[PDB]
Amino acid sequence: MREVISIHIGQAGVQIGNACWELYCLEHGIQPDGQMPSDQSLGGSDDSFSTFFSETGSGRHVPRAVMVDLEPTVIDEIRTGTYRSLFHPEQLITGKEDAANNYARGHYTIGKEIIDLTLDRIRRLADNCTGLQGFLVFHSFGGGTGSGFTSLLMERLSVDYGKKAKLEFSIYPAPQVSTAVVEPYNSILTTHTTLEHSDCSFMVDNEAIYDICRRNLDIERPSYTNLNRLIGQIVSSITASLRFDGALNVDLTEFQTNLVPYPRIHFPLATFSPVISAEKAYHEQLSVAEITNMCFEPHNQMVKCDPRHGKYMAVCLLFRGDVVPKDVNAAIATIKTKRSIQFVDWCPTGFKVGINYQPPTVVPGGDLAKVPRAVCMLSNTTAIAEAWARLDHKFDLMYAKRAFVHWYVGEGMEEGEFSEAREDLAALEKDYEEVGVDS
Amino acid sequence: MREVISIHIGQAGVQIGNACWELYCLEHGIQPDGQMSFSTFFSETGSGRHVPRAVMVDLEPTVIDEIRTGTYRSLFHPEQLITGKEDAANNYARGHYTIGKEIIDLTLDRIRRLADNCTGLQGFLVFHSFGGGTGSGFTSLLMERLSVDYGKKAKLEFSIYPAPQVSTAVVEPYNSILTTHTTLEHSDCSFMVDNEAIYDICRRNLDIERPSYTNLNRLIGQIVSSITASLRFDGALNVDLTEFQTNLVPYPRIHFPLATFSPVISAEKAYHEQLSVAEITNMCFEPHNQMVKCDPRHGKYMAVCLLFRGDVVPKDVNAAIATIKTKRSIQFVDWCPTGFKVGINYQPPTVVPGGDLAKVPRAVCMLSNTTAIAEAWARLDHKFDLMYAKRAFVHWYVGEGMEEGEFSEAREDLAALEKDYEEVGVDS
Amino acid sequence: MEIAFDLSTIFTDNIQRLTRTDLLKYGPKRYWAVAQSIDCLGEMSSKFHGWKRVITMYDKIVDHDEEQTTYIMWEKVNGSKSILKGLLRVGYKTLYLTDNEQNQYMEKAMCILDFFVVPTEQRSGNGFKMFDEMLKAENVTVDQCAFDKPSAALQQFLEKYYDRKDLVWQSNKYALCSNFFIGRHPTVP
Amino acid sequence: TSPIGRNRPRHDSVADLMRQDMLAGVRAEVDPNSPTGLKNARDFGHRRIW
Amino acid sequence: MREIVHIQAGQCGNQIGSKFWEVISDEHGIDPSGQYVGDSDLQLERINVYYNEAGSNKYVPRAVLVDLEPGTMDSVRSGPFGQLFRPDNYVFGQSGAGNNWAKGHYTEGAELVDNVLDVVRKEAESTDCLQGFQLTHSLGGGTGSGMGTLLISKIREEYPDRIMNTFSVVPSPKVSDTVVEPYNATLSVHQLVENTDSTFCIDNEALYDICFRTLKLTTPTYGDLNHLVSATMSGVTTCLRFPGQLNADLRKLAVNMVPFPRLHFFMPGFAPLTSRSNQQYRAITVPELTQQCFDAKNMMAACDPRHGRYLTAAAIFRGRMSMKEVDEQMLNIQNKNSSYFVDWIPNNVKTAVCDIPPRGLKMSATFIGNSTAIQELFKRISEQFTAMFRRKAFLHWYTGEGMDEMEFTEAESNMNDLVSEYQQYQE
Amino acid sequence: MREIVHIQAGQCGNQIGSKFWEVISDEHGIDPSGQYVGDSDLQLERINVYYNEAGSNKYVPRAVLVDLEPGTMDSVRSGPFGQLFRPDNYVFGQSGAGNNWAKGHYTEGAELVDNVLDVVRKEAESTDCLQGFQLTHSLGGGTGSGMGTLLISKIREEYPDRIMNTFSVVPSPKVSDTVVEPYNATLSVHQLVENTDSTFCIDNEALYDICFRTLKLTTPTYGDLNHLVSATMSGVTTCLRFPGQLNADLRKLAVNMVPFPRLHFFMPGFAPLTSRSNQQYRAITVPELTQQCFDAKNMMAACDPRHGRYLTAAAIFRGRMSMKEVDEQMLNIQNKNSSYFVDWIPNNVKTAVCDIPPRGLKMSATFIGNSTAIQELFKRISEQFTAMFRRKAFLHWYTGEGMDEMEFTEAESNMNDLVSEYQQYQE
Ligand SMILES: Nc1nc2c(ncn2[C@@H]2O[C@H](COP(=O)(O)CP(=O)(O)OP(=O)(O)O)[C@@H](O)[C@H]2O)c(=O)[nH]1
Ligand SMILES: Nc1nc2c(ncn2[C@@H]2O[C@H](COP(=O)(O)OP(=O)(O)OP(=O)(O)O)[C@@H](O)[C@H]2O)c(=O)[nH]1
């Protein structure tokens, strides 16, 4: 039984998890109140819904999720919302004061008060599951809770479980669109925990998805709900292989083996290619070749970076729906023939292809058109070093004058931790620079 | 075929009886007016009414008047609702020698009339409270008369034990010490219950901030229904009252089991919990789940009775018992290699509308005879010694026919019982 | 397949409607035949369909939170012997439905939870009689019912006796007919 | 309401296990549109070539 | 000509007997209403062994149902085969023994054994030539154990020379569900050793292990265990009711199996036990049945035969099979497992082949092993008995019924001799 | 008399094995439920080569299905011929090897190799006279490429004299879909060289090219490729199951085609492969079958035989035919293509003519080719391995399971040694 525990931390993580679990409930035929009306589905595809949802004696299904936040506004919004009766009441963990957009508050001060309860709930979830595949961590780099509490929790998870896969999806700060004034500090500090205790960290930018929504979905004023829906589509595409059967499956271990060359090079990009409005899908064939070609366009990446200035190392194409492997082979052939898409010389084959026979599930009220096939390209490219460089430059400008250091040193953090994290991210940038040099 | 008589004495016993009979009416489908297996608790009249086999006796007529004016006006037999003129006023002597004698004859006549109407009488169910005056003295007198009259018939009495700290009367230790003598010589199986422990259960498991007496009485009624379900619901591994006593009571004086109901959980949390047999069996043995304010870990178990209900499979029970016996904290006496008496039933517990309990698919009532109950008697010994070193209210007792030597005799008897538990809890 | 009781002395018709109240009245203690027949039919359906568990049980039906009804087809064999022909368990449920053009609906619809015929007793028009008896019993048409993961065979059977094909599959693994004339959509497409 | 009898304790699974002649050995067909159906048709099924 | 009287005592015995009668009626084609709905003339050839003739093509079992509690008796009456038994054979008391051997033997069973014998004698003297009696009970209970031993003594006094069989369920610590069951078991073994011709020890833990490992039953019930015991019972007495290439009745088995008068405790078994998945992919042949009968995991007793030496063995095959194959299989078993067989007995296995297989089965084999490993169950029971008797743990209940403490000492000492005697012939 | 034990490892191996058993059951008239429904007595005469029996006209394949991922086991069981295999033969672990040779060869598959060897042995001594083993796996994965080689080494240790045939799907750059597959292929080639009697190298790109240009398949899925591979499987071993004028078993082919111990890497093929359009436009005679077998387009390995002279060739014909035609066709192929065959070997082609063609085909021929062009696939694999290992691209995943870089260098050196050995006989 292939089954995975998902953790949603902070406001961004919890709000993303709302859309993710809505998508999971839609995919597995589970009502928002936890009931599964399809009586035959319980006796049929047992391994399908067992990945994300548990089961009780009354027939209800409880998601294997722990949503934790240091302030109870968003969690209470869940408890008063449509899915109030879906999640286990003890799996929604709250504090009373947030981290106040501070890494130190979320890590030491307010973190340590409920880190024990969060670990207890996670351990209770893990004991119930028999085939734990890994962990899905949702948080935000620039937040206080989603940075500090995530840093505090990832190390404890690593020292408790260990060999389990810790795949974390995070909202990386955008180069220009920033909703916080001290988010470079939080992101620099959480770089340490996302580099060591994580296994495959997926970065996401808000501006990149805003541009994707504008260009493809033809919406000029989008919001957080659309971004969360797209990230939920990405995570569902990633985890489709565990819960559904298809030719050429790719599980988490295969994913990490193929896409992570070196221990520190585990920061892939992310792009759900067939994103298009309903008014445009009628005029498109949406074949394998074109949805594979849209993957490598810089306008489709969900990190505000230019892949042309770098070199791809490993690419994981997770197709789903009506897909035959010969079309995929032709698609990689055409991509390799392209001179603009430059790979490294030490990776003769850099495409790890996974195919699933379950087509993407369309959420009612969403802006995503119904498509026969979909692909979730997930590349380990060196172009993310430029986003790291932008963040490092912002941090250097903020830290030159010691702009907000007192806020961090007044909550148990030492002033040298900023320098340590800065040096760590500089070392990561140097590693990404020295991995791309031709041999 | 298998009939049992239930007697409720005092305010606490009578209100617990109200809860119990509401639960039984819900279980058997009997309407509150008596109109409609049931032969255990109810006697069917020729016209179709079902009347409980219960005698409600209390010197104070207030609560019985509440019954006679409430929803269950038509349920009980009017002559079975026995009242006096004035209560014992928290006085053991008043309820034993002074006011108890006024209606002891009528109570015994009603009990005899009930017993003669049933051919398969199994035992008695006496509900009362130690701390009261009626429920202590009158229960002592009535139960001694019942032991004289019947004898071999089982006498299973459910008592509300005084809490270690929570109290509603200043003379509770005196009455409890006085009734310790009678509850040890006449009763065949005495289940003492603590109000404070049920308050803790309602606060923690059920997440109730301000529980009332209704909730406590509902849990006690659930316990009694679980105990007596083997006599009226068919299931594998039936446990008779005599079988219950034989398996649970090792020595003539060691007949004070605990009581608990593990699948007590809030309604919202019930739908998100598996509530498997192993889980409920594990949480039966939780120290904070017992309904007496004592720590079972300090004492050593001597005999445990597990009365499972609902959807239960014997293999799951055996696996749960093996897991329990593997645990080091759950310690049994060496001279009881097989400490578990397992009973299963096919009838799941019924849910009272407006109650704090949810509709669990399976339930279990763990009834442990353990030495850890001696802590409560030690607490009452300390209270009685403090209150008797100066003779705070002994004059109220000696002015109602009771003699000064009764207090010393009762204290010696309870000390001897505590010593018996101390000397039986040791290993061979 | 075969039950060792004369079901004619209990059941009034060859296809008897067994609601939850009927099953509670016909307890296994004194009416073991009906409960054993229901459990046997459910086990046979689960074994045929390859399911790892039985979804149609008398105990599971009686203790369910919401009322359900069961249809059993039998025939006379001997003085104390009867043969079981098919199973049909249905009930009313609330469904979160989504029609064409992503229109969101939330209406009470009747579900066909289980509909099975013994493999050696299939064909010969079996099952159609039970389904018609059900529809006449509670005046429900196919236009207002729901199918739980319609099998290829039910997809054809309904195609070849109600001509109702090209069904739409809801997100809850339910397939309904294209007749969404119920209206009052909670959410605009 | 009324007490409810249970039929699960009466089940005799061994009776069907002894009768080997009573084994069916017939499985239902998978849904072609289901992902298992596509897998069966493509990875395990093949098109006639001669 | 070889009629058998069947008596069921207690809930365990009553349920096992009900399952046994259902199995037998299936074998002989007896309609649950009591009619004959068979399809062969061999079923009616020797139907008189277990059933009486009611005239109008109705066959009432020769069974006496006894219990001190009417609840189990009513449950039997309300079952699928409730109408099979004659109503006058139902012998129910007022209240159960309450897991008390003294209650079930000295008082409550004492004022009921008279009514029990008044119908046991009626069934016995209504037969052409009685072959013996068979009892089903549980040693751990009060009613079953105590009343079964009392009735055993009464019948043995009344019928000294007939064969007295008992199918007694032996308690084990692994599936214990009673606090005072070792007392009842120790008190029962005293009478079982002295007043029985063959006692087939059966254990619930072994039946659970079989149903979990071999049959791979996810959720076993008492129906499954009773069906296994019923299949063993039907296999034991199958040469009486059907023709065979090598017949062996109860007395033949007793002569060939017991070396000494009190060594009559056996481990039963069944050969064709196969899982649902492996039913089609397994070839049911004589060799396979042989190694499954002699497999340690297939024994219906907790004790492992590899911890002792076999005194005698008996495998009763059912179905058409060559005698050469059976003989060579037994020779192979003797040679391979020579360390587990006593060397002072030249040949240990008493084989028997029956022509009629069980319904739905191509061939079958019922195993009966007389091994010194049986002493393990009694050693465990004696350990528990001594542990509780060192402190007089629950003896006031037994002394209240008139039985004195001296009886417990005699029962333990006498049962300790039984353990030593099996250990005497174990090397 | 000459039984064959079949082993399936990995997803590709399991799917190819399912297709192979489907084709064999088609040839032997075996119902997908295991029953025999063949219309000819020839099919059942030597069904023991590939099938055991369960008595009631039911045959179970002598196949061992293994995969560390239980999902593939469930997919196989749910296939069209899923219930044909014995449930005990399914051996699975907890999770897949994750495309890691180190995992499957040292920890994850090494835990399960003991159970795999146990079941393989239980099948092996169940045979009257075992001939050898045949294994289906993929060299580009973790489970197949690693654990199958470990099992190959263990089997060769246990049975040094029995034949060992492997049908390995070697990776190719054109249709590559795994990043770390060069490492697995290079590590597996050493074991394949050391512990195999005849390796039939199969390539996905070659199969796709065949399906696209010969059969003119518009959408060739994995089923078509598996069917072609399975047709080769059935053609190779046809003389062990049916009579013919000139019979050649696996030992005969190994003797003919292996001049030196390490040169046992072959190229499969199939004669009657033709498009649906040209079914009636072509006559399936011996010259046409010979030409298409020796054509470079029809061969199932990506390497071009035109760049390498054949060492030995083996065309195993089927169906009724004349052996004058066959001999003269082989002589014509030898003569007209004298530059494509080694001169120091006077005769390179070995022929075998079974008398039973595949169902639906009048006559068929399976080509096996020990050409020197095999060095091309390993040249490409070694190029990819060197490019990746120059910078240790993904070496930490392998070193985290206990592997070493010296192991990688040794494997690369030995694989280049095999390439040089094949090149030595070129000119
Ligand atoms: N194999 C079986 N064991 C059973 C069955 N019913 C009970 N038992 C076991 O029997 C043991 C206790 O035996 P009983 O319940 O018969 C006690 P008994 O009725 O003989 O005496 P009383 O309790 O005095 O009525 C204990 O191991 C039960 O788990 C059954 O149907 N099959
Ligand atoms: N995509 C997406 N991003 C979000 C969402 N909510 C917040 N963010 C981003 O999250 C970043 C960090 O802010 P928060 O996530 O609120 O921080 P936090 O983790 O809640 O920490 P505290 O401020 O201490 O509560 C901001 O820059 C937002 O742009 C959301 O629902 N979706």
CATH number (domain holding residue C112): 3.40.630.30
Residue in B with minimal Cα distance to C29: B234
Specify whether the CB–CB gap between E229 and E341 falls below 8 A: no
CA distance B114 to chain E (A): 19
Beta pairing class for E163-170 and E198-203: parallel
Contact A37 C149 (CB under 8 A): no
Coil, helix or strand for F196? coil
Tokens for A387, please give them.
Answer: 């986003």
Tokens for F300, please give them.
Answer: 């199932």
Residue whose C-alpha is closest to residue B35's, from B76, B75, B78, B71: B75
Tokens for C71, please give them.
Answer: 């249809």
> Which residues, 6 or more positions from B134, have their beta carbon under 8 angstroms from its beta carbon?
B9, B10, B11, B58, B59, B60, B87, B88, B95, B100, B128
What are the residue ranges of helices labelled H in F241-285? 250-257
For chain D, say whether B351 makes contact (Cβ under 8 Å): no
Record: fold of B375-424: Helix Hairpins (1.10.287)
Active site residue B243: yes
d(CA A17, CA A9): 9
Contact A247 D42 (CB under 8 A): yes
Which residues of chain E lie closer than 8 angstroms to F87, CB-CB? 277-278, 281
Tokens for E255, please give them.
Answer: 């002569």
φ, ψ for residue E46, nearest 5 deg: -130, 40
Residue in A with minimal Cα distance to F10: A248
Say which amino acid occupies C146.
A
Provide Rg for chain C, Cα atoms. Answer: 17
Cα(B197) to ligand 1 centroid in Å equals 36
Number of cross-chain residue pairs from A and B with Cβ atoms under 8 Å apart: 26
Record: fold of F265-372: 60s Ribosomal Protein L30; Chain: A; (3.30.1330)
Say which amino acid occupies F31.
D
In a domain, C183, yes or no: no
Say which amino acid occupies C28.
P
Question: F85: part of which helix (H) or strand (E)?
Answer: none
Q: Where are the domains of chain F?
A: 3-257, 265-372, 376-424
Tokens for E392, please give them.
Answer: 């007089």
Say which amino acid occupies A203.
M
Indicate the length of chain B as a whole number.
428
Which residues of chain B lie closer than 8 angstroms to A55, CB-CB? 274
Residue whose C-alpha is closest to residue F104's, from F195, F183, F170: F183
Nearest by CB: B273 against A34, A56, A85: A56
What are the residue ranges of helices labelled H in E125-221? 148-158, 181-194, 204-213
State whether CATH 3.30.1330.20 applies to domain A271-383.
yes
Question: F121: part of which helix (H) or strand (E)?
Answer: helix F108-124
Say which amino acid occupies B239.
V
Q: What is the 3-state secondary structure (H, E, C) of chain A?
A: CCEEEEEEEHHHHHHHHHHHHHHHHHHCCCCCCCCCCCHHHHCCCHHHHCCCECCCCCCCCCECEEEEECCCHHHHHHHCCCCCCCCCHHHEEECCCCCCCCHHHHHHHCHHHHHHHHHHHHHHHHHHCCCEEEEEEEEECCCCHHHHHHHHHHHHHHHHCCCCEEEEEEEECCCCCCCCCCHHHHHHHHHHHHHHCCCEEEEEEHHHHHHHHHHCCCCCCCCHHHHHHHHHHHHHHHHHHHHCCCCCCCCHHHHHHHHCCCCCCCCCCCEECCCCCHHHHCCCCCCHHHHHHHHHCHHHCCCCCCHHHCCEEEEEEEEEECCCHHHHHHHHHHHHHCCCCCECCCCCCCEEEEEECCCCCCCCCCCCCCCCEEEEEEEEECCHHHHHHHHHHHHHHHHHCCCCHHHHHCCCCCCHHHHHHHHHHHHHHHHHHHHCCCC
Beta pairing class for F130-138 and F3-9: parallel
In a domain, C187, yes or no: no
Beta pairing class for C174-176 and C168-169: antiparallel
Beta bridge mates, F298: none
Count of helices and strands (H, E) across chain C? 5, 8
In a domain, C182, yes or no: no
Regarding the beta carbon of A317 and ligand 2, being less than 6 Å apart is answered: no
| Ligand 1 pocket, Cβ-based, cut-off 6 angstroms | B 243; E 10-12, 15-16, 68-69, 96-99, 104, 138, 140-144, 169, 171, 177, 204, 222, 225-226
DSSP state of B351: P
Architecture of domain A3-259: 3-Layer(aba) Sandwich (3.40)
> Which residues, 6 or more positions from F102, have their beta carbon under 8 angstroms from its beta carbon?
F146, F397, F398, F399, F400, F401, F402, F403
Residue whose C-alpha is closest to residue E203's, from E236, E228, E234, E237: E228
For chain B, say whether A34 makes contact (Cβ under 8 Å): yes
Regarding the beta carbon of A236 and ligand 2, being less than 6 Å apart is answered: no
Regarding the beta carbon of A206 and ligand 2, being less than 6 Å apart is answered: yes
Question: D44: part of which helix (H) or strand (E)?
Answer: none
Specify whether the CB–CB gap between B336 and B303 falls below 8 A: yes
Q: Is there a binding annotation on residue A206?
A: yes
Say which amino acid occupies E405.
E
φ, ψ for residue E39, nearest 5 deg: -130, 10
Which CA distances in Å does F356 have to A61, E294, F44, F320, F361? 57, 46, 13, 7, 10
**What CATH homologous superfamily does F376-424 map to?**
Helix hairpin bin (1.10.287.600)
Residue whose C-alpha is closest to residue D10's, from B313, B311, E221, B348: E221
Specify whether the CB–CB gap between E97 and B241 falls below 8 A: no
Beta bridge mates, E35: E58
d(CA E101, CA F260): 84
A287-300 per-residue burial string, b: 16 or more CB within 10 A, e: under 16: ebeebbbbbbeeeb
The ligand placed nearest to the CA atom of residue E101 is 1
Specify whether the CB–CB gap between F171 and F381 falls below 8 A: yes
What are the residue ranges of helices labelled H in F195-318? 204-213, 222-236, 250-257, 286-293
Record: fold of B3-248: Rossmann fold (3.40.50)
Residue whose C-alpha is closest to residue F232's, from F362, F139, F368: F368
In a domain, C159, yes or no: yes
Which CA distances in Å does E127 have to A433, C166, E51, E334? 101, 72, 10, 40
Which residues of chain F lie closer than 8 angstroms to D45, CB-CB? 80, 223
d(CA F134, CA A344): 39
Q: How wide is the angle at C-alpha A162 spanned by C-alphas A156 and A166, nearest 5°?
A: 80
Neighbours of F372 (CB within 10 A): 23
Record: fold of E3-250: Rossmann fold (3.40.50)
Residue whose C-alpha is closest to residue C91's, from C114, C117, C59: C114
Tokens for A250, please give them.
Answer: 């790719």
Specify whether the CB–CB gap between E141 and E181 falls below 8 A: yes
Nearest by CB: F98 against A253, A261, A263: A253
Nearest by CB: B233 against D3, D8, D9: D3
Q: How wide is the angle at C-alpha A430 spanned by C-alphas A426 and A434, nearest 5°?
A: 175
Question: What's the number of domains chain C is made of?
Answer: 1
End-to-end CA distance of chain C: 48
Beta bridge mates, A198: none
Regarding the beta carbon of A16 and ligand 2, being less than 6 Å apart is answered: yes
**What CATH homologous superfamily does F3-257 map to?**
Tubulin/FtsZ, GTPase domain (3.40.50.1440)
Specify whether the CB–CB gap between B90 and B175 falls below 8 A: yes
Residue whose C-alpha is closest to residue A422's, from A187, A169, A107, A203: A187
Specify whether the CB–CB gap between E58 and E30 falls below 8 A: no
Record: fold of B267-373: 60s Ribosomal Protein L30; Chain: A; (3.30.1330)
In a domain, C162, yes or no: yes
Residue whose C-alpha is closest to residue E22's, from C32, C4, C40: C4
Tell me which CATH code domain A386-435 carries: 1.10.287.600
d(CA F198, CA F250): 9
Say which amino acid occupies A38.
S
Q: Is C183 left (phi over 0), alpha (psi -120 to 50) or beta?
A: left
Specify whether the CB–CB gap between E169 and E130 falls below 8 A: no
Q: Is there a binding annotation on residue E226?
A: yes
Which residues of chain C lie closer than 8 angstroms to E33, CB-CB? 79-80
Specify whether the CB–CB gap between E181 and E140 falls below 8 A: yes
Regarding the beta carbon of A148 and ligand 2, being less than 6 Å apart is answered: no
Q: Secondary structure of chain D: what % helix, strand, coil (to 5)?
A: 45, 0, 55
Residue in E with minimal Cα distance to D21: E360
Q: Where are the domains of chain A?
A: 3-259, 271-383, 386-435
Task: Order the strands of the F364-371 sheet from edge to edge.
Answer: F244-246, F349-354, F310-318, F364-371
Count of helices and strands (H, E) across chain F? 15, 12
Find tokens 């870089």 and name the residue: F405
Residue whose C-alpha is closest to residue E411's, from E8, E105, E11: E105
